[PDB]
C-alpha cells in the first residue's frame, strides 16, 4: 500500500505515497545498551 489514488484540490489522480529522539531510537548502540 505504497500509493494511493486520491483526487486533489483540483483535477485528480494524484497518486501520491502513504525528530532527533525518533531517529536516536533506531540507532544500533541504543539496542546494545
Request: hydrophobic share 50%; glycine share 6%.
Amino acid at each position: 500500500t505504497t500509493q494511493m489514488f486520491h483526487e486533489d484540490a483540483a483535477g485528480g489522480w494524484q497518486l501520491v505515497a502513504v525528530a532527533c529522539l525518533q531517529k536516536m531510537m533506531r540507532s544500533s548502540v541504543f539496542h546494545m545498551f
